Amino acid sequence: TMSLGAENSVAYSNNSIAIPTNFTISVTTEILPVSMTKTSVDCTMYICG
Amino acid sequence: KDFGGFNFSQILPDPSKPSKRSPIEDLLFNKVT
Numbered sequence: 001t002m003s004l005g006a007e008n009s010v011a012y013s014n015n016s017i018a019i020p021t022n023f024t025i026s027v028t029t030e031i032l033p034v035s036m037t038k039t040s041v042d043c044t045m046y047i048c049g
Numbered sequence: 050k051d052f053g054g055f056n057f058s059q060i061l062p063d064p065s066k067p068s069k070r071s072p073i074e075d076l077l078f079n080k081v082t
């Protein structure tokens with residue numbers, strides 16, 4: 001049975017905050033298709049030659 | 050559930066239900082046939 005994620009319990013309280021003291025410059029890739037191969041079929045030649 | 054007066058019981062999961070769904074989610078699953 002597949003796990004959904006690592007279990008994290010957020011330390012919530014009514015008067016506590018978490019402030020970052022540092023940062024990471026993260027570069028991620030996103031691949032998106034744009035076009036296909038332009039195909040033309042001669043219908044008469046395909047059916048009959 | 051001390052959120053400064055904000056109540057999320059209708060959207061948080063219900064421990065009493067075996068399906069662990071919220072009351073709103075339980076109603077949504079009952080209303081779709």
Ligand SMILES: *[C@@H]1O[C@H](CO)[C@@H](O[C@@H]2O[C@H](CO)[C@@H](O)[C@H](O)[C@H]2NC(C)=O)[C@H](O)[C@H]1NC(C)=O
Pocket residue numbers: 009010011012018
């Ligand atoms: C902020 O404080 C809370 C509690 O003082 C920390 O939460 C605990 O983290 C330890 C280590 O992972 C756990 O074993 C405890 O169960 C956590 N307690 C609660 C109530 O969640 C939290 O890690 C602290 N935040 C930072 C950034 O140090």
Ligand SMILES: *[C@@H]1O[C@H](CO)[C@@H](O[C@@H]2O[C@H](CO)[C@@H](O)[C@H](O)[C@H]2NC(C)=O)[C@H](O)[C@H]1NC(C)=O
Pocket residue numbers: 021022023024
């Ligand atoms: C914030 O994080 C960076 C890493 O992203 C820290 O830079 C590192 O510092 C240690 C100790 O001086 C070096 O050994 C590493 O080589 C550093 N890494 C890089 C990429 O420069 C930086 O010190 C952190 N700053 C604070 C205030 O925590």
Ligand SMILES: *[C@@H]1O[C@H](CO)[C@@H](O[C@@H]2O[C@H](CO)[C@@H](O)[C@H](O)[C@H]2NC(C)=O)[C@H](O)[C@H]1NC(C)=O
Pocket residue numbers: 050056057058
């Ligand atoms: C959050 O909302 C729920 C429901 O809206 C509250 O539960 C009601 O509590 C009263 C008295 O405690 C009961 O008479 C109702 O029957 C309860 N309704 C349900 C659906 O359980 C709840 O008290 C509110 N507050 C908190 C802190 O959870």
